[PDB]
Amino acid sequence: SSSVPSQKTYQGSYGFRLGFLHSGTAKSVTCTYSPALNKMFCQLAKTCPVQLWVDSTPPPGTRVRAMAIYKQSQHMTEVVRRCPHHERCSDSDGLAPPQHLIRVEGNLRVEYLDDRNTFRHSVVVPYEPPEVGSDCTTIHYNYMCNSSCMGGMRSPILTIITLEDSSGNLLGRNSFEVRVCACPGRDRRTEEEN
Ligand SMILES: [Zn+2]
């Protein structure tokens, strides 16, 4: 079945929002977020911290899902996946399917889904409330193809983050645009000038 995943931001009843590190745009930066563009700029396979902020702690058994989609165009119905150079290369972590663009690092409770109905790829982790004295929870995502690998790239790629309960009920949704590139700090600077 076709699908056009919702992009609609929805804090819901726990006040679910995203946060990113304020990393600036030095040469050395591997991952930087633009508030102005609502856009991440990261390197392939590198760490991208994404914070989850909540006004009320959701119940035990809550889960966090990420899915990439093409934001717009004739590509809206196209499942985002890795290119052949990257799909068929030597880089499995033993947990991620080789086609999945998005991975989570450093979590042995990560789970990967090819949807049996829509064929969309997604990655889920358990929601862990922040440690006492911490304000948010952080997930380290890794993006496993560059923006240049993507065939719809008539279209930006959007990461959609959803909070869901143990039964799959949606509690919250947020999203940001994502560029996988050689020089995140330079491309952000450049894109904001534009
Ligand atoms: Zn690729």
Side-chain angles (χ1 to χ4, degrees), residues 83 86 145 149:
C83 74
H86 285 113
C145 269
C149 302

PDB file of all heavy atoms in Angstrom, residues 83 86 145 149, ligand 1:
ATOM      1  N   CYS A  83      21.567   3.722  -1.116  1.00  0.00           N
ATOM      2  CA  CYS A  83      21.924   3.436  -2.506  1.00  0.00           C
ATOM      3  C   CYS A  83      22.636   2.076  -2.618  1.00  0.00           C
ATOM      4  O   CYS A  83      23.009   1.512  -1.589  1.00  0.00           O
ATOM      5  CB  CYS A  83      22.813   4.542  -3.020  1.00  0.00           C
ATOM      6  SG  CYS A  83      24.501   4.461  -2.334  1.00  0.00           S
ATOM      7  N   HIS A  86      26.221   1.791  -1.165  1.00  0.00           N
ATOM      8  CA  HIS A  86      26.219   1.658   0.303  1.00  0.00           C
ATOM      9  C   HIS A  86      25.452   0.437   0.858  1.00  0.00           C
ATOM     10  O   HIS A  86      25.918  -0.168   1.808  1.00  0.00           O
ATOM     11  CB  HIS A  86      25.847   2.966   1.005  1.00  0.00           C
ATOM     12  CG  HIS A  86      26.940   3.983   1.009  1.00  0.00           C
ATOM     13  ND1 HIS A  86      26.852   5.170   0.311  1.00  0.00           N
ATOM     14  CD2 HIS A  86      28.132   4.017   1.661  1.00  0.00           C
ATOM     15  CE1 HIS A  86      27.950   5.881   0.509  1.00  0.00           C
ATOM     16  NE2 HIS A  86      28.740   5.204   1.330  1.00  0.00           N
ATOM     17  N   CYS A 145      23.917   6.910   4.176  1.00  0.00           N
ATOM     18  CA  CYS A 145      24.166   7.358   2.783  1.00  0.00           C
ATOM     19  C   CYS A 145      24.271   8.895   2.794  1.00  0.00           C
ATOM     20  O   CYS A 145      23.685   9.545   3.657  1.00  0.00           O
ATOM     21  CB  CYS A 145      23.030   6.975   1.828  1.00  0.00           C
ATOM     22  SG  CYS A 145      23.128   5.433   0.986  1.00  0.00           S
ATOM     23  N   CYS A 149      24.010  10.357  -2.600  1.00  0.00           N
ATOM     24  CA  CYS A 149      23.505   8.995  -2.869  1.00  0.00           C
ATOM     25  C   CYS A 149      22.000   8.914  -3.189  1.00  0.00           C
ATOM     26  O   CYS A 149      21.555   7.983  -3.898  1.00  0.00           O
ATOM     27  CB  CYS A 149      23.713   8.079  -1.671  1.00  0.00           C
ATOM     28  SG  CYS A 149      25.371   7.871  -1.093  1.00  0.00           S
TER      29      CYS A 149
HETATM   30 ZN    ZN B   1      24.902   5.845  -0.553  1.00  0.00          ZN
END
